[PDB]
């Protein structure tokens, strides 16, 4: 059949850029999603580094989360030095079914609005 322009996998919600901290948080805090819906915003001063927001549905009152993903040349990305992955997507694969210490395993990358 026809060739589609740019064979897409995701590149929406989970894989985001350097949106403001409160912006990425605005999309998770929405009642449209829940704990596991994430944002992986970039560090705008990054050495290939990212960051990550998660909807923490705690007893305090629906707060996001914040993590520090450093991009390794020899290990892709790491948040906890114990858990490293060759790329964020391998990080977002494992976390989907088992957050593994993130206290919030992924579910659905926010609410696609485009």
């Amino acid at each position: 059949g026809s060739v589609a322009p740019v064979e897409t996998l995701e590149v929406e919600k989970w894989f985001f850029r350097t949106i403001s901290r409160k912006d990425a948080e605005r999309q998770l805090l929405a009642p449209m999603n829940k704990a596991g819906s994430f944002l992986i915003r970039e560090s705008e001063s990054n050495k290939g580094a990212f960051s990550l927001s998660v909807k923490d549905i705690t007893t305090q009152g629906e707060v996001v989360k914040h993590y520090k993903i450093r991009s390794l040349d020899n290990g892709g990305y790491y948040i906890s030095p114990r858990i490293t992955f060759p790329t964020l997507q391998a990080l977002v694969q494992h976390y989907s079914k088992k957050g593994d210490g993130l206290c919030q395993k992924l579910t659905l990358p926010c609410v696609n609005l485009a």
Side-chain angles (χ1 to χ4, degrees):
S2 158
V3 178
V6 189
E7 298 296 339
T8 342
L9 298 313
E10 270 290 276
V11 305
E12 289 192 77
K13 293 299 200 290
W14 90 240
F15 199 52
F16 253 33
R17 277 181 305 285
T18 170
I19 202 182
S20 169
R21 210 169 189 170
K22 63 30 184 185
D23 274 323
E25 280 37 336
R26 91 212 204 273
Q27 308 215 256
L28 297 167
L29 290 155
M32 290 190 265
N33 314 122
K34 50 83 188 293
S37 33
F38 283 29
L39 269 269
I40 212 145
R41 70 88 74 177
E42 87 177 79
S43 150
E44 43 61 88
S45 63
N46 83 52
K47 33 62 71 220
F50 277 83
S51 330
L52 189 48
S53 330
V54 182
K55 211 316 73 37
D56 169 36
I57 303 183
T58 176
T59 176
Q60 295 97 58
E62 211 225 63
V63 307
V64 193
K65 281 279 189 177
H66 300 329
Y67 310 86
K68 50 277 242 71
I69 29 218
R70 288 75 151 70
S71 58
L72 323 315
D73 53 278
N74 58 78
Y77 291 90
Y78 89 82
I79 29 177
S80 320
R82 61 89 81 173
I83 49 178
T84 330
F85 286 87
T87 170
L88 291 181
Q89 86 224 246
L91 150 162
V92 208
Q93 91 189 139
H94 182 236
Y95 297 173
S96 298
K97 307 306 183 183
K98 210 273 166 159
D100 196 39
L102 271 210
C103 73
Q104 274 102 43
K105 77 92 93 74
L106 330 196
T107 74
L108 309 160
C110 319
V111 49
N112 58 86
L113 294 171

